[PDB]
Design a protein around this motif. Sequence first.
Motif, PDB file in Angstrom:
ATOM      1  N   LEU A  83     -31.712 -10.360  68.184  1.00  0.00           N
ATOM      2  CA  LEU A  83     -30.350 -10.595  67.757  1.00  0.00           C
ATOM      3  C   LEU A  83     -30.072 -12.093  67.699  1.00  0.00           C
ATOM      4  CD1 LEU A  83     -27.809  -9.097  66.889  1.00  0.00           C
ATOM      5  CD2 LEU A  83     -27.074  -9.141  69.276  1.00  0.00           C
ATOM      6  N   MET A  84     -29.969 -12.603  66.477  1.00  0.00           N
ATOM      7  CA  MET A  84     -29.856 -14.040  66.250  1.00  0.00           C
ATOM      8  C   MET A  84     -28.441 -14.523  66.436  1.00  0.00           C
ATOM      9  SD  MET A  84     -32.616 -14.536  63.057  1.00  0.00           S
ATOM     10  CE  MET A  84     -32.996 -16.470  63.193  1.00  0.00           C
ATOM     11  N   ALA A  85     -28.310 -15.809  66.754  1.00  0.00           N
ATOM     12  CA  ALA A  85     -27.008 -16.444  66.878  1.00  0.00           C
ATOM     13  C   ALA A  85     -26.410 -16.584  65.489  1.00  0.00           C
ATOM     14  CB  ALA A  85     -27.136 -17.796  67.551  1.00  0.00           C
ATOM     15  N   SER A  86     -25.087 -16.651  65.418  1.00  0.00           N
ATOM     16  CA  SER A  86     -24.371 -16.565  64.157  1.00  0.00           C
ATOM     17  C   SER A  86     -23.577 -17.846  63.833  1.00  0.00           C
ATOM     18  CB  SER A  86     -23.478 -15.316  64.178  1.00  0.00           C
ATOM     19  OG  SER A  86     -22.360 -15.404  63.310  1.00  0.00           O
ATOM     20  N   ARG A  87     -23.891 -18.423  62.671  1.00  0.00           N
ATOM     21  CA  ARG A  87     -23.258 -19.642  62.142  1.00  0.00           C
ATOM     22  C   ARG A  87     -21.732 -19.420  62.012  1.00  0.00           C
ATOM     23  NH1 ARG A  87     -26.510 -22.093  58.509  1.00  0.00           N
ATOM     24  NH2 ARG A  87     -28.671 -22.467  59.231  1.00  0.00           N
ATOM     25  N   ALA A  88     -21.321 -18.288  61.430  1.00  0.00           N
ATOM     26  CA  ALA A  88     -19.901 -18.010  61.146  1.00  0.00           C
ATOM     27  C   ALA A  88     -19.071 -17.818  62.417  1.00  0.00           C
ATOM     28  CB  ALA A  88     -19.765 -16.790  60.247  1.00  0.00           C
ATOM     29  N   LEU A  89     -19.707 -17.242  63.437  1.00  0.00           N
ATOM     30  CA  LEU A  89     -19.085 -17.030  64.738  1.00  0.00           C
ATOM     31  C   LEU A  89     -18.895 -18.352  65.504  1.00  0.00           C
ATOM     32  CD1 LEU A  89     -17.998 -14.904  66.923  1.00  0.00           C
ATOM     33  CD2 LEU A  89     -20.376 -14.779  67.682  1.00  0.00           C
ATOM     34  N   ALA A  90     -19.909 -19.228  65.482  1.00  0.00           N
ATOM     35  CA  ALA A  90     -19.789 -20.569  66.097  1.00  0.00           C
ATOM     36  C   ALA A  90     -18.612 -21.402  65.542  1.00  0.00           C
ATOM     37  CB  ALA A  90     -21.096 -21.344  65.992  1.00  0.00           C
ATOM     38  N   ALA A  91     -18.223 -21.125  64.294  1.00  0.00           N
ATOM     39  CA  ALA A  91     -17.105 -21.785  63.618  1.00  0.00           C
ATOM     40  C   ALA A  91     -15.790 -21.015  63.719  1.00  0.00           C
ATOM     41  CB  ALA A  91     -17.454 -22.025  62.156  1.00  0.00           C
ATOM     42  N   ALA A  92     -15.851 -19.707  63.935  1.00  0.00           N
ATOM     43  CA  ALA A  92     -14.617 -18.920  64.020  1.00  0.00           C
ATOM     44  C   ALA A  92     -14.125 -18.712  65.454  1.00  0.00           C
ATOM     45  CB  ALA A  92     -14.776 -17.585  63.308  1.00  0.00           C
ATOM     46  N   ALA A  93     -15.054 -18.664  66.408  1.00  0.00           N
ATOM     47  CA  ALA A  93     -14.738 -18.350  67.806  1.00  0.00           C
ATOM     48  C   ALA A  93     -13.724 -19.316  68.417  1.00  0.00           C
ATOM     49  CB  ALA A  93     -16.009 -18.321  68.643  1.00  0.00           C
ATOM     50  N   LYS A  94     -12.654 -18.779  68.987  1.00  0.00           N
ATOM     51  CA  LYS A  94     -11.626 -19.624  69.606  1.00  0.00           C
ATOM     52  C   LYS A  94     -11.821 -19.753  71.120  1.00  0.00           C
ATOM     53  CE  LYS A  94      -8.294 -19.399  65.866  1.00  0.00           C
ATOM     54  NZ  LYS A  94      -6.914 -19.105  65.399  1.00  0.00           N
ATOM     55  N   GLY A  95     -13.014 -19.378  71.579  1.00  0.00           N
ATOM     56  CA  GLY A  95     -13.387 -19.438  72.989  1.00  0.00           C
ATOM     57  C   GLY A  95     -14.459 -18.422  73.367  1.00  0.00           C
ATOM     58  N   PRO A  96     -14.724 -18.275  74.678  1.00  0.00           N
ATOM     59  CA  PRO A  96     -15.711 -17.320  75.189  1.00  0.00           C
ATOM     60  C   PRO A  96     -15.407 -15.852  74.839  1.00  0.00           C
ATOM     61  CG  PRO A  96     -15.059 -18.879  76.900  1.00  0.00           C
ATOM     62  CD  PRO A  96     -14.087 -19.037  75.770  1.00  0.00           C
ATOM     63  N   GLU A  97     -14.125 -15.499  74.773  1.00  0.00           N
ATOM     64  CA  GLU A  97     -13.700 -14.100  74.637  1.00  0.00           C
ATOM     65  C   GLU A  97     -14.112 -13.447  73.313  1.00  0.00           C
ATOM     66  OE1 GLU A  97     -11.347 -16.690  74.801  1.00  0.00           O
ATOM     67  OE2 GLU A  97     -10.948 -16.555  72.647  1.00  0.00           O
ATOM     68  N   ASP A  98     -14.239 -14.255  72.266  1.00  0.00           N
ATOM     69  CA  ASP A  98     -14.694 -13.765  70.970  1.00  0.00           C
ATOM     70  C   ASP A  98     -16.189 -13.416  70.982  1.00  0.00           C
ATOM     71  OD1 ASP A  98     -12.164 -13.854  69.719  1.00  0.00           O
ATOM     72  OD2 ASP A  98     -12.406 -15.972  69.228  1.00  0.00           O
ATOM     73  N   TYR A  99     -16.976 -14.198  71.707  1.00  0.00           N
ATOM     74  CA  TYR A  99     -18.383 -13.871  71.881  1.00  0.00           C
ATOM     75  C   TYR A  99     -18.539 -12.579  72.659  1.00  0.00           C
ATOM     76  CZ  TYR A  99     -19.504 -18.527  70.263  1.00  0.00           C
ATOM     77  OH  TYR A  99     -19.667 -19.655  69.503  1.00  0.00           O
ATOM     78  N   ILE A 100     -17.695 -12.390  73.668  1.00  0.00           N
ATOM     79  CA  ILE A 100     -17.749 -11.187  74.488  1.00  0.00           C
ATOM     80  C   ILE A 100     -17.474  -9.956  73.619  1.00  0.00           C
ATOM     81  CG2 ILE A 100     -16.624  -9.916  76.378  1.00  0.00           C
ATOM     82  CD1 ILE A 100     -16.346 -13.021  77.549  1.00  0.00           C
ATOM     83  N   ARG A 101     -16.423 -10.016  72.798  1.00  0.00           N
ATOM     84  CA  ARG A 101     -16.024  -8.895  71.934  1.00  0.00           C
ATOM     85  C   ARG A 101     -17.061  -8.562  70.863  1.00  0.00           C
ATOM     86  NH1 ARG A 101     -10.328 -11.691  71.556  1.00  0.00           N
ATOM     87  NH2 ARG A 101      -9.857 -11.446  73.785  1.00  0.00           N
ATOM     88  N   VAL A 102     -17.595  -9.597  70.214  1.00  0.00           N
ATOM     89  CA  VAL A 102     -18.584  -9.426  69.156  1.00  0.00           C
ATOM     90  C   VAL A 102     -19.851  -8.791  69.717  1.00  0.00           C
ATOM     91  CG1 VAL A 102     -20.154 -10.679  67.607  1.00  0.00           C
ATOM     92  CG2 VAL A 102     -17.698 -11.089  67.492  1.00  0.00           C
ATOM     93  N   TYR A 103     -20.438  -9.412  70.734  1.00  0.00           N
ATOM     94  CA  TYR A 103     -21.626  -8.851  71.383  1.00  0.00           C
ATOM     95  C   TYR A 103     -21.358  -7.510  72.101  1.00  0.00           C
ATOM     96  CZ  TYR A 103     -24.357 -12.975  70.184  1.00  0.00           C
ATOM     97  OH  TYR A 103     -25.020 -13.977  69.498  1.00  0.00           O
ATOM     98  N   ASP A 104     -20.091  -7.225  72.392  1.00  0.00           N
ATOM     99  CA  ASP A 104     -19.720  -5.934  72.957  1.00  0.00           C
ATOM    100  C   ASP A 104     -19.850  -4.828  71.896  1.00  0.00           C
ATOM    101  OD1 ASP A 104     -18.524  -3.847  74.705  1.00  0.00           O
ATOM    102  OD2 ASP A 104     -16.636  -4.303  73.674  1.00  0.00           O
ATOM    103  N   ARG A 105     -19.325  -5.061  70.693  1.00  0.00           N
ATOM    104  CA  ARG A 105     -19.446  -4.059  69.644  1.00  0.00           C
ATOM    105  C   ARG A 105     -20.883  -3.957  69.142  1.00  0.00           C
ATOM    106  NH1 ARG A 105     -14.065  -3.214  66.661  1.00  0.00           N
ATOM    107  NH2 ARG A 105     -13.686  -2.797  68.889  1.00  0.00           N
TER     108      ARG A 105
END
Length: 386
Positions: free
Chosen positions: A154-176
């Motif tokens: 599971l690769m890291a995501s360019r669009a997420l690194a630019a959209a994420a407004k903090g740790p909580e967005d990474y938690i939600r994305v990797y949660d789903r």
Amino acid sequence: LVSIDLPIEGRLARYDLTGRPVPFNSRDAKAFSRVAFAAAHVVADPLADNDPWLAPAIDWERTLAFRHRLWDLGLGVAESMDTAQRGMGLGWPEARELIRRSLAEARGRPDALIACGAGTDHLAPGPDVSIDDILAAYESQIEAIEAEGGRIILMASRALAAAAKGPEDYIRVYDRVLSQVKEPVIIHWLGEMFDPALEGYWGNADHMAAMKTCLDVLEAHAAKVDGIKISLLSKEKEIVMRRQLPKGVRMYTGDDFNYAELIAGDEEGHSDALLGIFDAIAPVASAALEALGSGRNGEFFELLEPTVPLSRHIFKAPTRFYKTGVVFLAYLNGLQDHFVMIGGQQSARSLVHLAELFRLADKAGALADPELATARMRRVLAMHGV
């Protein structure tokens, strides 16, 4: 006694080859006491009517032949990864096709370990790209891969690194994402020296604090996570992380500067391997992983320590161009007949760097065929008017 004149300091100096090539020997992964992948490179087609900096043309036969070489040596294959120039020359369509062909080759062999990079790379980072858009991107690629019977990296995501407004967005994305994968995954934390657009991944600019968020995800979905590959080239950061890892979650080293030390491990643990360097030194890595698996730690280091300087050279700043040294080494070893790369990256290292690469390859026993390597180096010098 093979000798060649090579460039150092604007001038040209005699270099006598002194290495004993580590002989290629077919091996079964069961001879190892580690799980080792090589992240494998791509062979370009030098006869295609492409725009080389714009769009790639791949030699499938030559590219797949190299997967078989890796399987033969007992190494696993990590496909369409950063070494295959993913996100930096290799688009998703070509990545999907490489994944499809490689899986098909794999099923054709009793002994083919392989895992496939799944990401977001078909989605442009954007000022209004949403979290939903990102989940759709992940599942699109994940489903594509699983449909060909592939296990996922599971690769890291360019669009997420630019959209994420903090740790909580990474938690939600990797949660789903992780609750929806079908099989255990290897999570990839790719550092900014490899991809500048992955700046502050996990939601913090500080790697020690980003680690916290990353660890939290792995705890939350441990059964769905076979391992984590860290590519930060910070050896202390790996050791600290592999000790806090949950039961049955492997540490795959991505540290091409420090792999020998980390793979052998300390009095607390070791790490496994998913390395672009294992591509370039495949035969040696295989031979050394066998010695390590035979409890022969002395021979492990005798074989691997000489490659380490070569590796540090190949991955030197600017590090994102390591793939050039990898493919150049493939070319010296006759695994391909040209030095033409996806993205036109043959040209991203100086001649001086390629000559130094040759000396360190010689002294590391990483030139399978010294006479051929020397002839090919000569053709490269001649092309540069030497």
